[PDB]
Amino acid sequence: GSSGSSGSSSSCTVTTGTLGFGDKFKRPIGSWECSVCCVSNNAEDNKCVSCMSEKPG
Numbered sequence: 638g639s640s641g642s643s644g645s646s647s648s649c650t651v652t653t654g655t656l657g658f659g660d661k662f663k664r665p666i667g668s669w670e671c672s673v674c675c676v677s678n679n680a681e682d683n684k685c686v687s688c689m690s691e692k693p694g
């Protein structure tokens with residue numbers, strides 16, 4: 638137990654140490670899985686449809 642804040646607030650993120658891709662994400666070869674919304678997109682489509690974000694790469 639540690640004190641020093643307003644109201645007990647449990648966190649999930651690792652303090653004093655941030656990581657990336659904590660888990661795996663099933664994505665197709667051709668198409669590309671968005672990151673902001675993580676919605677299916679069209680390889681040819683240089684943008685998203687759910688968030689309309691520019692395709693990475």
Ligand SMILES: [Zn+2]
Pocket residue numbers: 671672673674675676685686687688689690
């Ligand atoms: Zn998107």
